[PDB]
Amino acid sequence: FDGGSRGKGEHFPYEQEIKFFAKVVLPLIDQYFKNHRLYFLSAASRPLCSGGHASNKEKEMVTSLFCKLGVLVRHRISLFGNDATSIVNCLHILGQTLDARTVMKTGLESVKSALRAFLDNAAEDLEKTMENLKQGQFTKGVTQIINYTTVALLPMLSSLFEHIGQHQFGEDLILEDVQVSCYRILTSLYALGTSKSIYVERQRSALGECLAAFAGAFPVAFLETHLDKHNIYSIYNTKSSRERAALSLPTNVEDVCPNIPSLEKLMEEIVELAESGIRYTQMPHVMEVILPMLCSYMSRWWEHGPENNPERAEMCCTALNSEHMNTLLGNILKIIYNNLGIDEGAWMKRLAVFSQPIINKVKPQLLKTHFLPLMEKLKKKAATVVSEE
Amino acid sequence: SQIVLPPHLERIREKLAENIHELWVMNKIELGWQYGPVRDDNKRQHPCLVEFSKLPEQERNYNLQMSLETLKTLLALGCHVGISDEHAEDKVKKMKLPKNYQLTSGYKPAPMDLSFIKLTPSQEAMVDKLAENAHNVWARDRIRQGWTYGIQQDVKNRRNPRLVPYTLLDDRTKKSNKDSLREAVRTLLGYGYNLEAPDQDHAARAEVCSGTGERFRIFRAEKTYAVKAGRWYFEFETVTAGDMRVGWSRPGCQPDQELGSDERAFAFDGFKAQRWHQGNEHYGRSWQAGDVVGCMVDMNEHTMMFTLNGEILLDDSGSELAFKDFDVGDGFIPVCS
Ligand SMILES: Nc1ncnc2c1ncn2[C@@H]1O[C@H](COP(=O)(O)OP(=O)(O)OP(=O)(O)O)[C@@H](O)[C@H]1O
């Protein structure tokens, strides 16, 4: 039908069959997977000890289904009769039901290549979105690819990154050639969150929530590059030197990630803007883009921090500390304190839901006289309509 | 006997068995056995150093039957029998060995470079099962001969400490025969005729055959200590982690019935993170070894609460009450299963 769309005949011969597909096959897939979240997760790995083993064959078939339906949703939103919402809901559910350890540990090579091709095509799709949007600021193929990107590309990558992060599965999934695409997506999303346009004004939220999921999903501390070489899992160590020369790799972390700043630099602009106390409406980009990295970054790499493991110290992948926390989260607190008086906003609700586990992470002896000010300030600001928790 | 032996195996094993015998004589003479016409085991003297044809026919029989039981056991394990490639019989790499590692005669000690092939852990477990089976066969042979287990080795009384289960078997002997079997099955792999072993997956009912017919024992206080008013507390320490339930019981609880299965007990299952009263629901989390569960009953508000290491357990909702409302009845006493 993509071929015959340019043809004069617009009467699709199997419209009945494609409507049966959309109305029946996809929703029954949805209900089955939603009734059975965990059966696919139960592969004798201890979840559902009563049984419910999902075979390895079943799981690569699930992965192939996911990849092929992603191929269907590629640039076909117009052909879909508004069912793209159902498409992306099934995208979610198959995302949560994915099992990356088992699928990568044992898998068929065509499914392997299909998943890698899917992630590469998604990455280059958002890349060409980047390129066209930034080269052209004048106002229908371009707007069609843009709204396709906003509607489908961001939610699917967000769902994949989220299930990866909340499982801690997917680290072995991102082992080779996934990381080049992941750096491309990182540079691209950072450029979206840095640039200003009516489009990014429309999706304030999407580009501020995708980065948080990407940080949690991604297993390499790109912020702390000083000890990144010394992580054995690093692709820099993996690629030897001959494979660098064969591939198109800059062989340097600073060369391959020049746009993203250092962790100390993010921290120092966070401190500067907190002490400045500017209104939310001069430069919302920072507390909607950098802050998700703070929350998600630190949430992901606590246990990978050297502090938790005195054994294997300074050869951990990151460098995290309770003193970092007492600095950065207090910085968040000062930001929310000084900006409660100006323009309020639901972005603080979004930050609260993101940082809900962070208060659990912080010790009770670190709650006292630190978060109690938050309680007394929130009840003192009864004049302000905003309430938290 | 019930398994049949395939044609590829039947015409390739003669070579496999002679290869295994050659490797056996080679690693023994390398670990230090020399040649001698006179037969002596303490003086490491082997009258059977000759080839399989000049080898004693009984020992050649032992070699054939050991490779039989090897491949037959491999098939019985569920091996997906299939042809891999004739490429290894086409091309094989013989190494050049220095005289120090060489033997006195001109035999080729290492026909194949054993190093480059690495054995999968799933494959490794099956070689462990092969060692288990061989040890059991030897043990039953000893039992047929009349040998029995003893703490001390004595041939006169036919006592052998080695007649123990392989898990209980001594580390040195078990690793020695384990590495010899490594070598045998691994050169079997190295001839390129690698049998396609089954994908090792574990899923089982997992030993419900517990000792005796008892599934649980219930410990309770005397019926005379039943409380009908006030606020009461006691602690329950879990030395281990497993199927244990703690809570409050009515004076009519039945010793043979599980706590909470009926209306006469209110219990908390920490093995499944469940609360039990006329059925099971989801409540709290699971304990570990050494965890202490505090049991709390309030008879004038008819409420029950539980703690794990001090913190109060929660229901599916935010409620802190394990059981919201119940009648006083004849009272309650501490109970644990
Ligand atoms: N005739 C044999 N020659 C060598 N090994 C044998 C023989 N018969 C069986 N085996 C295998 O080797 C093991 C011991 O054989 P071997 O004659 O080398 O004894 P050992 O290790 O020196 O000690 P032990 O005196 O305790 O038998 C047996 O348990 C069996 O697995």
Side-chain angles (χ1 to χ4, degrees):
Chain A
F1 292 166
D2 284 312
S5 47
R6 299 155 270 144
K8 62 96 176 180
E10 274 318 289
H11 59 87
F12 284 153
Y14 292 147
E15 61 92 17
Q16 192 266 300
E17 283 91 303
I18 59 170
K19 300 296 102 175
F20 170 72
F21 181 76
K23 273 74 175 175
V24 181
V25 173
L26 180 75
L28 62 84
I29 279 182
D30 207 306
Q31 183 57 252
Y32 186 69
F33 292 135
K34 74 171 74 173
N35 277 328
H36 315 111
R37 297 284 75 78
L38 188 153
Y39 164 88
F40 318 128
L41 277 296
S42 60
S45 68
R46 285 285 72 74
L48 191 77
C49 63
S50 70
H53 178 74
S55 69
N56 268 16
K57 274 71 69 177
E58 180 177 359
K59 63 177 70 67
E60 71 270 13
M61 293 182 286
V62 167
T63 59
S64 46
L65 286 235
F66 176 81
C67 299
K68 63 189 282 197
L69 62 84
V71 170
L72 276 296
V73 71
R74 288 199 60 206
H75 319 100
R76 297 283 79 78
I77 49 169
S78 67
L79 183 63
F80 292 132
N82 300 110
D83 62 272
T85 60
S86 80
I87 297 291
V88 71
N89 291 331
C90 289
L91 267 199
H92 309 111
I93 65 164
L94 282 72
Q96 293 83 18
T97 60
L98 276 185
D99 191 358
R101 274 69 174 174
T102 47
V103 169
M104 294 298 102
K105 286 189 283 185
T106 68
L108 185 108
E109 77 273 17
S110 62
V111 163
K112 298 288 187 180
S113 70
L115 188 153
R116 275 97 177 152
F118 180 76
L119 59 86
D120 296 327
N121 296 115
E124 61 86 19
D125 287 342
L126 61 83
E127 287 293 324
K128 70 179 184 292
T129 296
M130 293 332 159
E131 293 179 353
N132 67 41
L133 191 147
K134 272 71 177 175
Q135 65 100 16
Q137 267 306 297
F138 179 76
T139 62
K140 300 289 95 175
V142 293
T143 187
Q144 193 272 326
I145 195 63
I146 289 166
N147 75 344
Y148 167 64
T149 293
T150 58
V151 163
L153 286 235
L154 286 157
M156 64 156 152
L157 294 174
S158 77
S159 54
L160 294 174
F161 293 162
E162 285 179 354
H163 81 286
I164 288 173
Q166 70 84 30
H167 296 100
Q168 237 73 353
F169 292 166
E171 271 69 5
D172 66 321
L173 174 62
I174 181 164
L175 76 166
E176 283 284 76
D177 291 331
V178 180
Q179 307 84 50
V180 168
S181 74
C182 283
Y183 291 166
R184 295 179 67 250
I185 306 169
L186 186 61
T187 49
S188 69
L189 294 174
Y190 182 59
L192 274 157
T194 311
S195 86
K196 194 267 183 183
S197 165
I198 155 169
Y199 300 96
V200 61
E201 289 306 292
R202 297 292 183 184
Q203 63 268 13
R204 293 289 88 192
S205 69
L207 302 163
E209 64 89 21
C210 198
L211 203 44
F214 182 76
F218 189 74
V220 169
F222 47 96
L223 277 192
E224 295 176 355
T225 64
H226 59 273
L227 52 81
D228 184 74
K229 64 90 176 179
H230 172 187
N231 175 259
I232 62 169
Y233 180 76
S234 180
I235 301 299
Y236 299 156
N237 304 8
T238 304
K239 291 285 181 69
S240 70
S241 67
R242 174 71 270 172
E243 198 183 5
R244 278 77 175 273
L247 274 297
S248 63
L249 191 88
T251 79
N252 315 292
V253 58
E254 73 275 16
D255 283 26
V256 70
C257 295
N259 51 325
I260 62 170
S262 70
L263 183 150
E264 296 83 5
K265 193 199 311 162
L266 280 4
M267 185 63 72
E268 62 89 20
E269 284 92 7
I270 295 266
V271 179
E272 198 272 331
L273 61 83
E275 62 85 20
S276 86
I278 57 171
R279 185 176 176 88
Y280 183 70
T281 64
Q282 293 82 17
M283 187 66 204
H285 294 88
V286 183
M287 73 291 291
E288 65 182 356
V289 172
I290 305 297
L291 274 295
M293 208 140 52
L294 271 69
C295 295
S296 58
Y297 182 76
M298 285 99 101
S299 66
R300 198 271 184 196
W301 305 274
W302 292 72
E303 72 270 16
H304 294 88
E307 190 274 333
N308 284 147
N309 294 119
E311 72 264 22
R312 182 198 169 64
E314 166 74 17
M315 72 291 291
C316 276
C317 316
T318 187
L320 188 149
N321 269 86
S322 181
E323 61 91 20
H324 294 89
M325 295 298 137
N326 289 6
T327 298
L328 69 89
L329 184 85
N331 218 349
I332 297 203
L333 294 174
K334 197 268 181 183
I335 281 155
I336 63 170
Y337 291 157
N338 66 9
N339 64 7
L340 275 176
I342 46 179
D343 188 86
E344 292 89 7
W347 62 271
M348 64 184 73
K349 280 73 176 175
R350 178 70 274 172
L351 273 181
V353 173
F354 281 137
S355 70
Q356 184 63 272
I358 311 303
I359 67 170
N360 311 334
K361 293 177 175 67
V362 184
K363 277 78 70 178
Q365 306 315 297
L366 282 67
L367 355 103
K368 28 86 149 179
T369 65
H370 303 89
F371 291 149
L372 278 70
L374 186 59
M375 292 332 95
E376 58 89 18
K377 195 71 164 68
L378 62 83
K379 73 179 184 291
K380 187 264 286 180
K381 296 299 291 184
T384 295
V385 64
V386 177
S387 170
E388 284 319 314
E389 181 178 0
Chain B
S1 74
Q2 79 280 19
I3 331 267
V4 71
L5 188 153
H8 43 94
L9 294 175
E10 69 83 21
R11 88 289 184 276
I12 203 65
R13 126 225 267 227
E14 211 290 315
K15 274 76 69 178
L16 277 296
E18 62 87 19
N19 189 179
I20 294 162
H21 189 274
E22 283 166 345
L23 295 173
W24 182 65
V25 55
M26 295 299 102
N27 59 349
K28 268 69 179 173
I29 62 171
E30 160 57 51
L31 61 85
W33 210 284
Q34 69 270 15
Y35 170 60
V38 60
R39 177 180 182 268
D40 292 285
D41 311 82
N42 61 335
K43 194 164 74 76
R44 65 179 65 88
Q45 297 298 289
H46 200 190
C48 311
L49 276 195
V50 289
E51 294 83 3
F52 68 100
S53 63
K54 292 197 290 183
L55 183 75
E57 289 292 328
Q58 68 274 16
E59 185 64 26
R60 204 273 170 280
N61 290 138
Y62 293 104
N63 196 22
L64 30 106
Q65 64 86 30
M66 61 79 71
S67 296
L68 294 174
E69 64 86 20
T70 287
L71 327 146
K72 299 291 286 296
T73 312
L74 276 165
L75 294 174
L77 291 149
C79 184
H80 294 17
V81 58
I83 186 166
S84 46
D85 54 289
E86 196 266 330
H87 183 72
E89 304 68 7
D90 272 333
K91 270 71 69 177
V92 64
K93 276 79 70 177
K94 319 292 253 183
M95 284 73 74
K96 303 292 101 180
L97 302 93
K99 184 66 172 96
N100 167 71
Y101 189 60
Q102 204 68 287
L103 73 164
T104 65
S105 65
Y107 298 154
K108 181 67 174 66
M112 61 79 71
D113 56 355
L114 184 63
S115 68
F116 69 95
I117 62 170
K118 299 289 94 176
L119 183 63
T120 302
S122 186
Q123 301 280 73
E124 196 78 86
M126 301 174 249
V127 190
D128 292 331
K129 271 84 74 175
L130 281 265
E132 160 56 17
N133 201 66
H135 157 261
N136 294 347
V137 173
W138 160 84
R140 185 189 293 128
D141 300 331
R142 289 288 191 267
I143 299 171
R144 292 182 179 92
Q145 299 149 19
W147 286 67
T148 57
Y149 162 74
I151 197 65
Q152 178 259 355
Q153 175 65 40
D154 181 37
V155 296
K156 181 69 176 177
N157 202 3
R158 327 276 308 263
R159 308 285 288 296
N160 181 18
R162 189 176 179 179
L163 292 176
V164 294
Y166 182 76
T167 63
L168 277 296
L169 194 66
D170 73 275
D171 192 75
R172 189 269 299 164
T173 57
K174 70 186 289 183
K175 70 92 177 178
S176 66
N177 69 15
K178 185 181 288 292
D179 62 60
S180 295
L181 236 115
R182 297 285 75 78
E183 186 70 27
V185 300
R186 184 176 176 87
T187 57
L188 179 85
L189 183 63
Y191 283 174
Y193 181 75
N194 49 357
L195 294 174
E196 286 82 4
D199 291 2
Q200 208 284 304
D201 53 352
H202 170 55
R205 184 266 298 164
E207 292 171 353
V208 148
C209 189
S210 171
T212 67
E214 212 188 4
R215 281 82 56 84
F216 54 93
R217 192 159 215 201
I218 297 171
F219 298 80
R220 71 160 169 84
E222 196 166 62
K223 291 184 204 135
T224 76
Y225 294 90
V227 288
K228 294 175 71 68
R231 301 169 72 92
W232 303 106
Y233 176 90
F234 72 94
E235 267 173 7
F236 174 72
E237 182 178 1
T238 66
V239 191
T240 58
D243 187 44
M244 301 175 359
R245 297 174 194 199
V246 67
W248 303 89
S249 166
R250 293 232 192 251
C253 186
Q254 284 174 33
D256 64 322
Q257 302 300 115
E258 197 51 271
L259 292 179
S261 68
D262 55 356
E263 72 275 351
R264 56 194 74 256
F266 299 76
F268 159 61
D269 186 12
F271 184 72
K272 294 293 158 222
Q274 294 216 284
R275 66 181 181 179
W276 286 85
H277 179 240
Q278 308 204 77
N280 50 325
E281 295 84 4
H282 180 273
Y283 170 81
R285 69 183 185 249
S286 75
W287 56 62
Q288 304 94 56
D291 284 25
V292 190
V293 183
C295 298
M296 292 181 277
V297 67
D298 193 4
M299 299 292 347
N300 60 9
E301 320 294 301
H302 312 89
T303 51
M304 291 172 176
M305 293 178 34
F306 290 91
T307 59
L308 187 55
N309 296 114
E311 63 89 21
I312 305 168
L313 301 164
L314 281 73
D315 299 63
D316 289 286
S317 66
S319 178
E320 301 295 329
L321 306 181
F323 305 96
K324 271 70 151 174
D325 269 341
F326 54 87
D327 57 353
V328 175
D330 51 0
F332 282 110
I333 56 174
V335 69
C336 68
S337 196

